[PDB]
Amino acid sequence: AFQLDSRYQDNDGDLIADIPSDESKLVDPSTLVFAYTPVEDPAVYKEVWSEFLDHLAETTGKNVQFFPVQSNAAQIEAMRAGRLHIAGFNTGSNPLAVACAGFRPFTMMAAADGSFGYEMEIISYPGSGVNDVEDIRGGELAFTSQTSNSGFKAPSAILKADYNMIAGEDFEPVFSGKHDNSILGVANRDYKAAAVANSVLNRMLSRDVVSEDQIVSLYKSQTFPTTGYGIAHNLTPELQEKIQDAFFSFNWEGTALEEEFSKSGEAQFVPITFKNHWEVIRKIDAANGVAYNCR
Numbered sequence: 174a175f176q177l178d179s180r181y182q183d184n185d186g187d188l189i190a191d192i193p194s195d196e197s198k199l200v201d202p203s204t205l206v207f208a209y210t211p212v213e214d215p216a217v218y219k220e221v222w223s224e225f226l227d228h229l230a231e232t233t234g235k236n237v238q239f240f241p242v243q244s245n246a247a248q249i250e251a252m253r254a255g256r257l258h259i260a261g262f263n264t265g266s267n268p269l270a271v272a273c274a275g276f277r278p279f280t281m282m283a284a285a286d287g288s289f290g291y292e293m294e295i296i297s298y299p300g301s302g303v304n305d306v307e308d309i310r311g312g313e314l315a316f317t318s319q320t321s322n323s324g325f326k327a328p329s330a331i332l333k334a335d336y337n338m339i340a341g342e343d344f345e346p347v348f349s350g351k352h353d354n355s356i357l358g359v360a361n362r363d364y365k366a367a368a369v370a371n372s373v374l375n376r377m378l379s380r381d382v383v384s385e386d387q388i389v390s391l392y393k394s395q396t397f398p399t400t401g402y403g404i405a406h407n408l409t410p411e412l413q414e415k416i417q418d419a420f421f422s423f424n425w426e427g428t429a430l431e432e433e434f435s436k437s438g439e440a441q442f443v444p445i446t447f448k449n450h451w452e453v454i455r456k457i458d459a460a461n462g463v464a465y466n467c468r
C-alpha cells in the first residue's frame with residue numbers, strides 16, 4: 174500500500190520520511206517558513222497565527238515567516254522544494270504531503286476533552302430548489318480542489334457509493350479553489366450545492382463572512398481528523414524537537430489563535446500519528462484512485 178517517494182527513506186515503518194543522518198542533507202535555516210492550510214483566504218489567518226509564530230521564534234531561536242500560500246498544490250510543492258519548513262496541511266493533503274513532500278506530521282487540534290475532528294457537509298442556500306442530496310442530480314456540485322477530503326474526494330466517494338451519482342454523468346462538477354469560495358458562492362447563490370468542511374463553515378459564520386440564514390445543510394459525513402501539523406523531514410533533529418516543543422508549550426489563553434479555533438471547537442494541540450489518525454483518509458484517497466505520483 175502507501176509508498177513514500179523514492180527520494181525519502183522509511184527505515185522504521187511509520188510511513189513518514191525519516192530524518193536524515195547525513196549532516197550535509199540537514200537544514201538549519203535562519204528563517205523558518207510556516208504556512209497554514211489555504212481553506213480560506215490566508216489574510217484571515219495571518220493575525221490568527223501571529224502570536225503563535227512569535228512563540229515559535231522564541232522557542233527555536235529563529236526568525237519566523239508566515240507564508241500566505243493560496244492553494245494546496247503550491248503548499249505541497251513549496252515543502253518538497255525546501256522553501257516551507259512547518260505547515261498545517263488540510264486533512265486530504267496529509268497523505269500526499271507525506272509521500273511527495275517529506276512532511277513529518279506530529280500534531281492536530283482537539284477540544285479540551287481530547288475529542289477532535291470535522292465532517293464534510295453538503296450545503297445549499299434556502300430557496301435554491303435543492304432540498305436534499307438527490308436534488309443535485311442533473312445540476313451542479315461545487316468542489317474546492319482535488320486534494321481536498323471534504324471538498325472533493327469524500328463527497329465524490331459518497332455520492333458514487335450511496336447515491337448512484339458520478340461527476341460528468343449525473344452532475345456537473347465545478348471547482349471554487351477554496352472552502353471559503355465554495356461557502357461564499359453558496360450564500361451568494363452562485364452555487365446551488367457545495368461540499369465543504371463544516372469546521373471552516375462554522376468559523377466563517379462566527380466571523381460573519383456568511384450568515385446562518387444563507388446556508389442550509391443537506392448532508393453530514395463521518396468524522397475525520399482535522400488539519401495535521403508537521404515539519405519538513407530534513408530539518409536538524411534538534412530544531413525539529415524545538416518546533417514540536419513550541420506547539421505544545423504555546424499558551425492559548427486570550428490569544429487570537431484561541432479566538433479563532435474555539436469557533437470550530439478546538440482548545441489544544443494533541444499528538445497524532447499519520448499511520449493511525451489518517452487511515453480513514455488514505456482509504457478515501459484509494460477509493461478515488463489517488464496514486465501519489467510525485468512525478
Ligand SMILES: O=P(O)(O)OC[C@H](O)CO
Binds near residue numbers: 321324398399400
Ligand atoms: O477537507 P479538507 O481536506 O479540505 O481539510 C480541511 C481542513 O483541513 C479540515 O480540518
